[PDB]
C-alpha cells in the first residue's frame, strides 16, 4: 500500500497497478455524461459544471470530425491533449487518403496512447476517460479507461452519480428501436436527470447535448431547440 503506490511501475502483491487504479477514479469525480445508441442515431448528453454563479458552465461535449464526437470526464488538461490527438488523426487520414477514419481503428489509435504513458516511469496514466460516440456506417459508442482499454457499449455513464444514471439505462431496452429522436433524446435526458442530485440544480439550458446519425453530422442541440426538450423532461 504505502510502498506499492509511489510509482506507476510497481505491482502490488496482488498484481494491481495502483498508480493507474488511482487515476482511474479521477474520472469518478467528473460530472455525469450519458450516451445512447439508437438504431441509426447516437445521442450524447453531459452535465456542464459551474464553479460559481458568475462563471460560465464548463464545456463537456467536443467535436472531433464530421461524425465523431466525444465527452471527456476526468482531468480537463489531459482530455485536451487527447482531443487534439484525435482531431489531428481524423484530419490526417482525410488528407493522406480521401476517406473517413475508421472509428474502430481511431479508438485503438487513442487507446494505445493511454498505454505508452504506462510502461515508462517518467510518465503518468491519463486521468481522463472518453466517450467516443460516432456513426461510421452504423452507430457506435466507445469508452477508454485510463489503463489501456476500450469497449463498445450500448449506453454509458461517467463518474459523479453514474450508478444512478446506469440504473435508468440498464432497465431500458427500448433504445435499440427508439427511432424518432424526440423519443430517444428524452430517454437520454431523463437518464442525465436521474444522476442529477435532487434538492439542487435541475437540468437547465446549461447542460450539453449533441447528436450524430445516418445523415446527421455531429451537431450541438441549440438552446432554443434544447429548451423545449427540458420541458418534456419535467413531465
Amino acid at each position: 500500500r504505502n510502498l506499492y503506490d509511489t510509482d506507476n511501475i510497481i505491482y502490488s502483491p496482488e498484481g494491481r497497478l495502483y498508480q493507474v487504479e488511482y487515476a482511474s477514479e479521477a474520472i469518478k469525480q467528473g460530472t455525469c455524461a450519458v450516451a445512447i445508441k439508437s438504431k441509426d442515431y447516437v445521442v450524447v448528453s453531459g452535465l456542464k459544471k459551474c464553479i460559481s454563479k458568475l462563471s460560465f458552465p464548463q464545456e463537456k461535449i467536443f467535436k472531433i470530425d464530421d461524425y465523431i464526437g466525444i465527452s471527456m470526464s476526468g482531468i480537463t488538461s489531459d482530455a485536451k491533449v487527447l482531443t487534439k490527438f484525435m482531431q489531428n488523426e481524423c484530419l490526417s487520414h482525410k488528407f493522406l487518403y480521401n476517406e473517413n477514419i475508421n472509428i474502430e481503428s481511431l479508438v485503438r489509435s487513442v487507446a494505445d496512447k493511454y498505454q505508452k504513458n504506462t510502461q515508462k516511469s517518467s510518465k503518468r496514466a491519463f486521468g481522463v476517460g472518453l466517450m467516443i460516440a460516432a456513426y461510421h456506417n452504423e452507430p457506435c459508442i466507445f469508452e477508454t479507461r485510463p489503463n489501456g482499454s476500450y469497449f463498445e457499449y450500448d449506453a454509458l455513464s461517467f463518474g459523479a452519480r453514474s450508478h444512478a444514471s446506469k440504473t435508468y439505462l440498464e432497465k431500458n431496452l427500448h433504445l435499440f428501436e427508439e427511432c424518432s429522436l424526440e423519443e430517444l433524446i428524452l430517454h437520454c435526458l431523463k437518464a442525465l436527470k436521474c444522476s442529477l442530485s435532487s434538492e439542487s440544480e435541475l437540468t437547465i439550458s446549461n447542460t450539453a447535448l449533441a447528436v450524430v446519425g445516418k445523415n446527421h453530422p455531429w451537431q450541438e442541440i441549440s438552446s432554443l431547440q434544447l429548451e423545449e426538450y427540458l420541458s418534456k423532461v419535467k413531465m
Partner: protein, 242 residues
C-alpha cells in the same frame, strides 16, 4: 525508477549550503598540505608527500605538483584520483587558448576555466563534485607572478600565500607571520620548508618528504623542480639559520 536510490548531489540544504561540497571541503581538509609563496624572483609551490612505503620510486615522480603549461603549474590537495581529471582538462584548456589566440594563456584565465568546470558539477548533472582543490601558480606578462586557490565549490581567489590541506591553520599562521612582501627565491624556499616543517609539527624536514618547485622567470620561464638531492642544501641551510 531509481528515485528512491538517488542522493540529490546538486540540492541545497536547509541552511542554504550544499552538503556534497560541504563534505568535499572536509575531504580536502584531511589531505596532505600544500604551500604557495610569491617572491620577487618567482612563485614557490611546495607540498607534503604523504608516506606510503619506502618501496615507492620517489626518484622521478611525485603526485602533488604537476605541470599544466610551460608558465603555469599547480599543487593539488585533495582526492589525487580526480585531480588528474582536472589536470588533464586544464592542460587541454591552456593548450587550446594557445591554439586560438596564438599566445600562452594568462593564469587568471585558465583558473576561471578550470573553476567553471569544477563548479558546473555542483550546479547541474546529479553527479558528485570534484573533491579536489589546488593552488595554481603561474607567471603572466600582464600581471606578473600569480597564485590562485581553487575550491570544490568552484570559487577561486588570488593569494600571496596559502597553505591548503591538513593542519592548514598552523601553516597559514607561520606564513602570515613571516611572509615579507619582498623576498628572494632562496629566502622563500627556506620559508616554504619552515611552514612545511611546522605544519606537520616536525622540527626539521626529511627530504624523503615535502618537495618544492618554482618558476623564477628568466625571460624564458625556466620552471624548475627539485629532485631530492637539491633539498638537502635547503635542509642544510634551514638547519644553519634555525
Amino acid at each position: 525508477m531509481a528515485r528512491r536510490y538517488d542522493s540529490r548531489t546538486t540540492t541545497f540544504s536547509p541552511e542554504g549550503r550544499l552538503y556534497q561540497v560541504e563534505y568535499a571541503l572536509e575531504a580536502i581538509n584531511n589531505a596532505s598540505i600544500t604551500i604557495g609563496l610569491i617572491t620577487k624572483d618567482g612563485v614557490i609551490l611546495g607540498a607534503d608527500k604523504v608516506f606510503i612505503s619506502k618501496l615507492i620510486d620517489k626518484a622521478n615522480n611525485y603526485e602533488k605538483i604537476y605541470k599544466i603549461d610551460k608558465h603555469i603549474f599547480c599543487g593539488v590537495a585533495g582526492l589525487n584520483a580526480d585531480a588528474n581529471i582536472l589536470i588533464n582538462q586544464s592542460r587541454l584548456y591552456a593548450q587550446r587558448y594557445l591554439y586560438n589566440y596564438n599566445e600562452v594563456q594568462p593564469v587568471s584565465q585558465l583558473v576561471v576555466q578550470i573553476c567553471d568546470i569544477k563548479q558546473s558539477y555542483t550546479q547541474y548533472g546529479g553527479l558528485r563534485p570534484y573533491g579536489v582543490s589546488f593552488l595554481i601558480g603561474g607567471y603572466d606578462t600582464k600581471d606578473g607572478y600569480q597564485l590562485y586557490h581553487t575550491d570544490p565549490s568552484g570559487n577561486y581567489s588570488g593569494w600571496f600565500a596559502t597553505a591548503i590541506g591538513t593542519n592548514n591553520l598552523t601553516a597559514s599562521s607561520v606564513l602570515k607571520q613571516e611572509w615579507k612582501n619582498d623576498m628572494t627565491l632562496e629566502e622563500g624556499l627556506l620559508l616554504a620548508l619552515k611552514t612545511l616543517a611546522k605544519s606537520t609539527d616536525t622540527e626539521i624536514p626529511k627530504s624523503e618528504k615535502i618537495e618544492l618547485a618554482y618558476l623564477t622567470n628568466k625571460d624564458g620561464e625556466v620552471y624548475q623542480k627539485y629532485l631530492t638531492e637539491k633539498e638537502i642544501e635547503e635542509l642544510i641551510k634551514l638547519y644553519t639559520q634555525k
